Structure formats: C-alpha cells, structure tokens
Design a binder for this molecule. Structure first.
Ligand SMILES: NC(=O)C1=CN([C@@H]2O[C@H](COP(=O)(O)OP(=O)(O)OC[C@H]3O[C@@H](n4cnc5c(N)ncnc54)[C@H](O)[C@@H]3O)[C@@H](O)[C@H]2O)C=CC1
Ligand SMILES: NC(=O)C1=CN([C@@H]2O[C@H](COP(=O)(O)OP(=O)(O)OC[C@H]3O[C@@H](n4cnc5c(N)ncnc54)[C@H](O)[C@@H]3O)[C@@H](O)[C@H]2O)C=CC1
Ligand SMILES: NC(=O)C1=CN([C@@H]2O[C@H](COP(=O)(O)OP(=O)(O)OC[C@H]3O[C@@H](n4cnc5c(N)ncnc54)[C@H](O)[C@@H]3O)[C@@H](O)[C@H]2O)C=CC1
Ligand SMILES: NC(=O)C1=CN([C@@H]2O[C@H](COP(=O)(O)OP(=O)(O)OC[C@H]3O[C@@H](n4cnc5c(N)ncnc54)[C@H](O)[C@@H]3O)[C@@H](O)[C@H]2O)C=CC1
Ligand SMILES: O=C(O)C1(C(=O)O)CC1
Ligand SMILES: O=C(O)C1(C(=O)O)CC1
Ligand SMILES: O=C(O)C1(C(=O)O)CC1
Ligand SMILES: O=C(O)C1(C(=O)O)CC1
Ligand SMILES: [Mg+2]
Ligand SMILES: [Mg+2]
Ligand SMILES: [Mg+2]
Ligand SMILES: [Mg+2]
Ligand SMILES: [Mg+2]
Ligand SMILES: [Mg+2]
Ligand SMILES: [Mg+2]
Ligand SMILES: [Mg+2]
Lengths: 328, 328, 328, 328
C-alpha cells in the first residue's frame, strides 16, 4: 500500500544539512542523523539550549549562517511565531539560494498559507506522533518509529526520494514505518484530536465529578479516585496500543463490556455531528485565524480559561489529595 | 433630477494635480486629463508601472513630492493596504498643507473611518462602474461614461464644483452622466453585489452540476456546456444592458419566460432576507473588521477557499474540457 | 471519453432530407448542409419566413409533401404547439412510411411522451446550446460548435452513425465537439437553468434594489448603475467562458474575491435544497403538465406576471434612465 | 376627487350601439338607453330571452350582424364561456372594423388576458354593484346608482369621454355616482368578497350550529332560529347601508356592542393574513387558471361540494323547518 518500510539514503550523502533548533526533536533527530553518517550543522537561539547543543558537540552558527552553508534546512521550532522568524531572518537568505529543500514537523503554517517559500525550493513534510522521548526509548532498542510523509512543492522531480532519504536519515524505517500524506492531512488530524475527543473526555469527567458531588452526596476523594486519580486509564491505553481497542476489553467484566458497547452505539450520532462541525471549521481555515488573532490580542481567553480550570472545585480537591499521597 | 450631464472645468485650470498610481484607472484618467488641457503629475512605486508611466511621458516624482507640488491629489491605488501608506508617506506631507482636495475611487477606507484627513482638506469621491478597459473602448468613440459623485468634507464651500470639474476632467460628461452620492452609498452598493447575487449565482451553478451528476447520471461535459461553458450568459447580459432586463426575455421561448417568472416571484422572499442580513452586516462596519483582520492574520481562509474551489470536481472537469476546445 | 471530435458523412449522401422550418436554426443548419453537399428540401408555414426561404433558394413544398419526399425529417419548430401539428399533418404521412429518421432540437415533447412515433422510425436528437446567431458568427470563422447527441428509438441498428452523420452535416465537428446524451438529460438540463439560477439571480437583483432604496435612502439611478444597468456582468461572463469561472476572479480585487468565496460557501446548502426540489419536480413530469395546462387555459399567469414585472418600480426607473442614455 | 356626478352624452348621439344580451343588465340598461334617446340594437341567442327581447320591441339580429351595424358593442353576457364566443363569432367581424369601442360588466376575462382585442378598439369597462333588480327599483324613483369606470385601451384619445357618455347613457349619473378604476381593481374587488368574508361567515355559522348541537345538547330548531333562519341579518345589513356599519350598533344592547368590538379587534390579524393570501392568489392569475381548468374537466369539485352542502345536517333541518313555517 502507501506505506514504505525502508528506502535509500543517497541524495543526502555529500550535502550539508541545516538543523534549526535543539529542543526535543531537534536534539533527537540531529544526534540520530550525525550517528547515521551525515555532515550536519545546527541553528539555534543562543540561550540555554545553545549551551546544551554546543555541549553535545554540534557546531552552531546563527540561523541564517546555517542556511547559507546548507542546501537543506529543517525548521524544528514552534508553530505560533515561526511566521515572523521566517519573514525576517530566513526568507532573505533563502532568496539567496537555488536548490533548497525545506522540511517541517507540522503543516499548520504551510497548509494554511502563512509561509509560502519560492518555487525555487522543494517543499516537504514529515511528522512523528510521539512526544519525543519515546523515540530514544525506542532507538536504544534499535527499533524504528512511524511517521507521515508529505510534499508541498517539487522543483527537482526528486522531492519524494529526498523525503524517504530524510526518513531513513532519522532512524524511523527500518524498524517502524513511513506513511505519505499531504501537509493538509497532518494538520487536520492533529487538530481534530485536540478539538474532539480530548476535550470531550475532560468535560465528561468534570461533569461526572460535579454531578456525583452536588446531587448524590459523594465525597470528593472517592470521585477523584474512581475517575482519574487512579492509573486505570493508563493501563487501558497501554492495552489498547498493544492488543487493539476492542480486544482490549476482554480483560474487563462482562458488565463493563455491555454498558460500554450499548452506550457507545447509542451516542455515536451526537459526537459525529460535533466532529463534522469541527473538521469543517478546520478545513476552511477559520481556526488558524482564531488562534493567530488570539495571539495578536495578548492571550486573554487563554489566561482566563487557565484560571477557571485551576480555580475549580475539582482542581482544589485534587490538590489536597495529591498532597496526601505524596504526589508532587 | 440628481443627475448631471455636463458642467464646468474652471477650478482645475491654473492648478497642479496629483495622480497617485499608473494602473488601470491611473493611466486612463491621467492620459485623459493631460489630453483635456491640464498640468498634471504622477506619483508611483518605482517599478514596472513606473517604467510604463515615464514611458508614456509623465514626469513621476516620489509620492510625497507629487503631493508637495500639487494642491489636489487622487489616490488611485488599492483598498487593502492604502491605510499604512497614507499613515506614513502622505499624512505628514498633507499636514504640511492648507487647501487640499483629495478624491478617491472607492469609499471603503473613508466610509468606515480607516482614513480621516484633517478639516483642512475638502474630501470627495467619484467612482466609475466599469473594469477600466471599457473606458478607452468608449473614449476612442468620443463617448462618455457614468460615475457616482460624493463629498465627505467641505472646507472651501467649493467641494461640489471641484467634484464636477474633476468629472469633466476625466471625460465622463458630456457623453455619459454623473450621479451624486455619499461615500457610504458607493461602498454599500459595491459590496452588496459582491456578497449577494454573484456568490448566489455561482453556488447555484455548482449545485446544479453536483446534483445532475450524482443523482441523475449525467456526463460532466454536458452539464458544463449547458450551465456556463457556453457563452449564453454573455449574450443575455449584453441584451440586458442594451434593451432592459425583462424586455430582454422576448427573444426567449415562452417556456423559458414562464418558468423564469414563476420561480422568480416564488423565491423572492428568501433572497430578500439574505440581502437584508448582508446589507445590515455592511452598514454596521462588521465586514470591514472581518476583512482587515483576515489580512492581519495572513490570509488563511482566502487561501483554503481558493484551494477548495479549484480542487473541486467541476474545476477539474472544466480543465479537461477547456483543454479539448483549445481554450487556454 | 464519450466525446466525438469528428465522424463520417456517408449515410446521408444519396438520400433526401426533410427540413421543417426556416427560423434561426432551420435557416442556419439548412444553409450549412446545402453547403456541405447534400440534397435537401424545406417545409414551412407559407408566411414571411416562407418568403425568405424561397428567397434564399430552397424549394419549399408543404410539410407533408416534404416528408413524403424525404426519408429523414428534422422538426426545427417550437415546443408548445408541435404536438397538434404532429398529430394532424405529420403522423398520417409518417404512417405512410417505413424507414424514417426523426431528429429534434429539444427533448421536451419526446422525453415526456407527448410525441410517440412508431417503431418504424429511428428516433434521435441533437441540440446546440447557443441562441443561433453565434453559429454563423463561428461558421464564417471556419470553426465548429458543441452539441448533445441522443437516440430514443433504434429500428435500423444505425441510429448512432446517422446521429454523427447529421452532426457533421451541420458543421459542428470538426471544429467543435459532440456529446452523446439521452433526450432526458437535455430536457432536464435546459429546464434546470431556466428554473434555478436565472430566476434566483433576477430576484436577488430586484431585492437589492428594493432594499437599497426603501431602507437606506439611495437614488434609483445609482442602484441601477451598480447592479445591472452597467455591462459589468457581460465582461465577467465573457472572462468566465474564456479562462474559467474561478480563474476569472484573479482580475478582481482581493476584497471581492474574499467576500464572494465566503458567501458562496456559506449559502451553498440552501440553493442546493432548492435545486433538488426543482430537479425532482422536472424528472417526474409535473412541470410539463403545469405548462401544457397553462396553455390550455389561455396564459393567464404568464400575462399577469409579465404585467407585474414591467409595472414594478425598478422597471419604470430603468425606463427613465435608458431613455437618458439614449439606449432604446 | 376621482368621482364624477354627471357628464355629457354627445359622442353616442348619431352612432348605433350594439347590445349583446337580454338578461338582467342587458334588458335594464338597454331599455334605459332607448328611453334616453339613442339608436340601439340587440344581439342574442335565439331562445326564450330572444322571445322576450323582440317582445319588448327591440330589433334583434344575430350577434355578428349587430356588431357589423354598430360602432360600439357591449358584451352583457357570462364570464365562464365568453372566451370561445368571442373567438368564433365576434373576433372575425371585429377584425372587419376600424373604430370600435367595447365595454364590459366584468374585468375577469380582460384583466387576465383571456380576451385581447386589437389596438383598433378603445377598450373600457363599467360595472354596477347591485344584482340588477334594484336598478329598476331605483329608476322608477328617478334616482341614479353607483358604478366603476375603467379604460383598458385608448386608440381615439376619447375613451374616457366615451366612458362617461355611456355612464349617463344608462341612467346612473345624475342620481348616483361614477368611480373610475382599472379592470384589475374591479376583478380584484369582486373576487375578494366572494373569497374572504362570505365563505368565512357561512363557515362560522355552520360551525356554531354543529358545536351547539353536538357539544351542548341543543335543539336544531333553536340554533337555526338564532343564527340565520331569522331575518335579523337582513335588518342589520339594511341599517348598515343606511346609517353606517358602526353607528348601526347604537340600536343594539351594550352587551352586544362590547362583545362584538372586543372580539373584532381580537381576531383582526388572523383574517388579515387570510385576506392577504387570497388577494395575492388573485393578483397573480392563479384563481383564473384554477377555475378555467375546473370548467375544462367537467365541474367535478363544484358538483361534489354542492352535494356535501345540501346533504349536511343543517340543510336537512332547515328543510324540515322551512316546511313548517310555510316558507318554500
Ligand atoms: N509536546 C509538544 O508540544 C509537541 C510539539 N510538536 C511541534 O514542535 C514544536 C515545539 O513545540 P513546543 O516545544 O512544545 O513549544 P514551547 O512552548 O515549549 O516553545 C518553547 C521554545 O520556543 C522558543 N521561543 C518561544 N518564543 C519565542 C519567540 N518569540 N521567538 C523565538 N523563539 C521563541 C523558545 O526559545 C523555546 O525554546 C511545535 O511547533 C509543534 O508543532 C510536535 C510533537 C509534540
Ligand atoms: N478590477 C478591480 O479590481 C477594480 C479596482 N477598483 C479599485 O482600485 C483599486 C485597485 O484594485 P486592484 O489594482 O485590482 O488591486 P491589486 O491586487 O491588483 O493591487 C496591486 C498593486 O498594489 C501595490 N501593492 C500591493 N501591495 C502593496 C503594499 N504592501 N504596499 C504598497 N503597495 C502595494 C502593488 O504595487 C500593485 O501595483 C482598488 O482599491 C479598488 O477599490 C475599482 C474598480 C474595479
Ligand atoms: N432563443 C430561443 O428561444 C431558443 C429556442 N430553441 C428551440 O427552437 C424552437 C424555437 O423557439 P422560438 O423561435 O424562440 O419560439 P417563438 O415564440 O419565436 O415561435 C414563433 C414561431 O412559431 C410559429 N407559430 C407560433 N404559433 C404557432 C401555431 N399555433 N401554429 C403553428 N405555428 C406557430 C410561428 O409561425 C413562428 O414562426 C423552440 O422549440 C426551442 O425548443 C433552441 C435554442 C434557443
Ligand atoms: N347576479 C349575478 O350573477 C351577477 C352577474 N354579473 C355579470 O353579468 C353576467 C351574467 O351573469 P349570470 O346571468 O348570473 O350567469 P348565468 O349562469 O345566469 O348565464 C346564463 C346565460 O348564459 C348563456 N349561456 C350559458 N352557456 C352558454 C354557452 N356555452 N354558450 C353560449 N351561451 C351560454 C345562456 O344562454 C344564458 O342566457 C356575468 O358575466 C357577470 O360578470 C354582474 C353582477 C351580478
Ligand atoms: O471500572 C472498573 O473498575 C472496571 C469494572 O469492570 O468494574 C474494570 C472496568
Ligand atoms: O436555455 C436555453 O437554451 C433557452 C431555451 O429557451 O431553451 C434559450 C433559453
Ligand atoms: O472589486 C470591485 O470593486 C468590483 C466591482 O464590483 O466594482 C470589480 C468587482
Ligand atoms: O343577538 C341579539 O338578539 C341581540 C342582543 O343584543 O341580544 C340584538 C343583538
Ligand atoms: Mg497529535
Ligand atoms: Mg498539535
Ligand atoms: Mg462594483
Ligand atoms: Mg469591490
Ligand atoms: Mg439552455
Ligand atoms: Mg429552454
Ligand atoms: Mg360583487
Ligand atoms: Mg363575481
């Protein structure tokens, strides 16, 4: 199928590579590649992470300097401010180039047009789905991890093979896999999760707490223990990742199975409508507007919601309890 | 009535005039006026259009220089960025003046307060309704064209006569006509069209295509031919402009007349509600906010909708077909 | 694909052809075919058009006489009364035949069963999409035009090749194209347009006028100029036919693009429902009933709506204005 | 105001007049005019009414003969079939004329386009509002009655003075009055009554009977006596015509006044909506279609409703009762 289990490493050997950032990915992928036999460099804001980068033995010039030396550059930095940084300190230098290849971790800025490099640059993506520490927790096992391949602009007829070259350049295949997919799909997917089932889950838990306490005279401690203060969810998620989402439930009681299945098929349409609405809202570009403007305004809503969440009854009770159990 | 069929040319003879821009209008109106016996100048961004402007024999200083020399200035440039340009490079110079007269092509920026010149400047508008090439396609015929007159600020008791002086200074009357109307009316009108019947028309066509193909098993080619790939609409519009909208239909079949009339009077209320909503949305200033913010954010929605429109089935089919017919 | 770019001319050479009518199509297609090397005749009501037909050098017997001489006949006459004329003056003669081929310009009467010739006649259609003058405006250019091919009844196993023979017999391919499609598709398409986007467009324009005048104190002249009294729509339609519907908008302002796209995607569902309703109403045969009965009753609704449209405020204002501009 | 209290009689003296029909109006108006000093004739179907017409001393040729002799003709015949009769036996003769003037009693057929005489005939209306016997019940009193003047087509610049000449030619002014009004207004008005308050009244009475009998155990006799079997309504209507609709109520009890006024102002909106709907239905021409088709089909609905009304309980009870009181 569309999957790729391993591929070549030719087009990157003989060229220099530009690594922008030394955070989670930057450090991991950079060290991996250096250990994969390639000449590489680093670009970074000269701060604590720069200390750590030059510590681990990576020559780190300024950003634009690392782009002048490299014919490839990977922008392993945030998604909320990258626009300005590209406008000022990268776009000029890039205009001073021919045959360049720019690859990102997230498609937010490109899928929505906030960054439009010239037609003189093959534009690509790949993105893994971990938080990043799992990838060393797998590399020391000699394993490989899964990722999502994308190409935005092709000015060399080689963007795809460059894609797989990079892929193998970071230690994903062989050992994991590599999927191919537009910038658009990656962004859509990453945002659907953050907008559909995570918040629904959290709101459901909060509602259960509130109800159980204010309408059935229950002790906060017991509610917290049942819903999330226990590690039940973690084990369930592990079993899901191992065996499968449904086959996981064989280790439960028949009562749990029955209730879960019935109520799942009973409420499927509601959440379906919700997911439709949110996915549409994303496909159109509305959420990117919303979020960019919330930055420009000074993050008021962010602030207020962070406050309301922590000043809620559930959070205070969780505080007292976690204190009791010694949990920090 | 409020119309004016021709008027004087006195207050502009003896004065210098400031022409900002050499695009469609700028070039046409400027050449017309030079050919109407007036001393004029040009202000322009020094680029290809500046090449063409100095080509056609118009001394072109910098913007602010052309405003220092002139006691009148006309801002024949876009509507999305004009704000900043006025703030930086025009407002200072203007503060260095007394007795100035500023006229625009569109009232967007003034009707909504994005540009508020001092009380030391008679502020006016006029705007034609063509795309611009029709006006030479009429001037070489010695004809005149119609326009909309507006006055925002009067500090000389002469703004209206300056208005008609300008009017005749561009070759509209005699030969066409000149209407008088606020900045507000012009903006309201130009935006109602772009928000009510153009998009409704396009959506209706798209829906007809989709339905005919996915529910009645029709070939894309035939659908495209019927709906818009033919020049039927062009001839209809021409006859409308010539004879009248309804009298135009006498050249149709009685079947078409009957169906059209019945369905027109049948759906009038719906579109009426829609038009009410949109006109209200405009009168209040909401759309200007929406659009300015969409600029500040980086044009995400614009980008995504441009993509969705071109990646639609109808567009791909139109591509294949137009290729077949040799149409570029 | 289903398209055909040129084909044979064999089955019509050696046979006589029956041309019923000398209107727009009749004259054009008849002259074309005579100029394509075929023996042809004409059938016509002996009136001014008969004068013009015998003028241009076409022997014109009576209808039934032209059918007795020909083994093919094409009924290039209206769609509202053709039924009776076929019942009286054509059905008998046709019953006096074997091996006949009848082709029409519109499928209304056949797609809905108002005319059911015998199984002794291969029954076909083709229909172009112009108004008719464009076809000489193309033939003098040596070009060809597009059309829609259909076969209703096959009693010779040759109906399709007769179809393409006729096609080339009228100067469409080579130079244009020829699509194949049932009688049903042609009728459905021609009627969807006349019922969905034309009347919606007109009602939207009318509503905009009414609103702008009665709720924002606008002068009728300016409204008329903006909405349709200008030739803006004609140029837009031309660019659509030339470049494409969406690519056409690149010549507009970004403001117009943004508003149009947003409002198009915002109102797509409403017009979709409307189009569904009307297409269903047509597929079932209801509209044909409606229209036939409106004929039998004496055209009352037709009359009254024609009156209401012309006695509207917009029409009177358009009258005064068109008078001012010299437009007849 | 628009009223006219008396006028001239000149244009009709010296000309012959064509009177079509000898029914209620025909006889009355014809005898009046003969008694007003004018040369007149009659056209009639040769039947009992023809017997009566030639009885009263009016030479009566055939219809077309009476139109050949006259330069004016008045069509004092029904509204359901007049179309055909005009098509066959009047349109030809009329085509054989120049300078003709046709006046009707009702605008149904003309206001809706079922009869469109040539531009060689000044087309007019006037219509009285009685049933016809009241007009002799007034003429023997030397009085005059009110009527509604209308002009459809003017080919002599004299249609209005012909109108008033006719008016005085029938004994309406002086003594009554004459209003001027389109064909459209007359038809609209005559049909609104027959569709709004007459049927509402009857349905209300019927509902009151049904309710009182089936939910409060009342004797049919008493219900019939209260609601309509008494002549209460007749006296009320007389007082309305004499004094005024509201001033009429001073002769009632305060209880009746209070209840009537309160419930009138309480239900005004409902009946207003109903009247709006029906008036719209008429203005468009829909009802004329409905009624013409009900003729063409054979009057099924008419028949069935006539049956249901007479086979109702109320009608049978009214039968028994009217029998008791000797009323036929
Ligand atoms: N756990 C996560 O957050 C994951 C993040 N990603 C992607 O990697 C990127 C990193 O995300 P995070 O590190 O979590 O965000 P973060 O909030 O931790 O960003 C902190 C870093 O951004 C720099 N920075 C902050 N503001 C800056 C400014 N105005 N100008 C220049 N530099 C500035 C700082 O130097 C600092 O090193 C994101 O774009 C995301 O798309 C992908 C997988 C998981
Ligand atoms: N066909 C149309 O678009 C019509 C335009 N108008 C009015 O005339 C004006 C011109 O419209 P268009 O030429 O079509 O827009 P446009 O998109 O073609 O504007 C391009 C011009 O704007 C300049 N420009 C762009 N960005 C700039 C920036 N940041 N700073 C300085 N200059 C910048 C460029 O030098 C370029 O010459 C509009 O404001 C509109 O209200 C009136 C009738 C029709
Ligand atoms: N512009 C258009 O109206 C188009 C028409 N067509 C098709 O071609 C046909 C012609 O349409 P139009 O010429 O526009 O209609 P039309 O209203 O112009 O019809 C006038 C013609 O019909 C004849 N006619 C009228 N009543 C008649 C009657 N009772 N008995 C015998 N002959 C009568 C007349 O002699 C006259 O020549 C239509 O059926 C239509 O399907 C196809 C493309 C465009
Ligand atoms: N009381 C009323 O009905 C009112 C009538 N009018 C108007 O006066 C006219 C007379 O109305 P009515 O006498 O009540 O209608 P009606 O139902 O009494 O019509 C009977 C007359 O119509 C003739 N007739 C019937 N069918 C015919 C046919 N196929 N062909 C030729 N002649 C036919 C008959 O010979 C007969 O003389 C109407 O058109 C109406 O507009 C105006 C005021 C009141
Ligand atoms: O929620 C629980 O504790 C479980 C049960 O079956 O009772 C294991 C799922
Ligand atoms: O849509 C069509 O082709 C028309 C027809 O009457 O059939 C000309 C309007
Ligand atoms: O962008 C504008 O203002 C247009 C107008 O409606 O006049 C050209 C489309
Ligand atoms: O309905 C009645 O009998 C009346 C009353 O007042 O009781 C006279 C009106
Ligand atoms: Mg994710
Ligand atoms: Mg994310
Ligand atoms: Mg416009
Ligand atoms: Mg605009
Ligand atoms: Mg059509
Ligand atoms: Mg049609
Ligand atoms: Mg009446
Ligand atoms: Mg009546």
């Amino acid at each position: 199928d569309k999957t790729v289990l391993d591929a070549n490493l030719d087009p990157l050997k003989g060229k220099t590579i530009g690594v922008i950032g030394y955070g989670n990915q930057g450090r991991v992928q950079a060290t991996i590649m250096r250990e994969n036999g390639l000449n590489v460099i680093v670009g970074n804001v000269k701060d604590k992470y720069y200390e750590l980068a030059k510590k681990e033995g990576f020559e780190v010039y300024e950003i634009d300097e690392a782009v002048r030396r490299s014919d490839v550059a990977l922008l392993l930095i945030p998604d909320e401010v990258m626009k300005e940084v590209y406008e000022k300190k990268i776009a000029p230098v890039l205009q001073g180039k021919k045959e360049f290849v720019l690859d990102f971790a997230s498609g937010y800025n490109v899928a929505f047009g906030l960054i439009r490099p010239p037609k003189s640059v093959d534009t690509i993506m790949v993105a893994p789905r971990m938080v990043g520490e799992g990838i060393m927790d797998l590399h020391k096992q000699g394993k490989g991890y899964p990722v999502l391949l994308g190409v935005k602009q092709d000015a060399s007829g080689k963007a795809w093979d460059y894609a797989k070259a990079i892929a193998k350049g970071i230690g994903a295949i062989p050992g994991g896999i590599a999927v191919i997919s537009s910038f658009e799909e990656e962004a859509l997917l990453d945002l659907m999760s953050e907008h559909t089932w995570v918040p629904i889950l959290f709101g459901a838990i909060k509602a259960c707490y509130d109800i159980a306490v204010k309408e059935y005279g229950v002790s906060p401690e017991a509610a917290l223990l049942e819903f999330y203060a226990s590690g039940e969810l973690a084990e369930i998620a592990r079993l899901i990742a191992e065996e499968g989402i449904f086959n996981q439930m064989v280790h439960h009681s028949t009562t749990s199975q029955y209730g879960t299945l019935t109520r799942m098929f009973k409420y499927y349409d509601v959440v379906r409508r919700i997911v439709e609405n949110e996915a549409k809202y994303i496909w159109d570009g509305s959420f990117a507007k919303e979020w960019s403007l919330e930055q420009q305004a000074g993050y008021p809503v962010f602030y207020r919601l962070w406050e309301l969440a922590t000043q809620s009854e559930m959070a205070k009770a969780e505080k007292e309890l976690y204190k009791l159990l010694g949990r920090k």
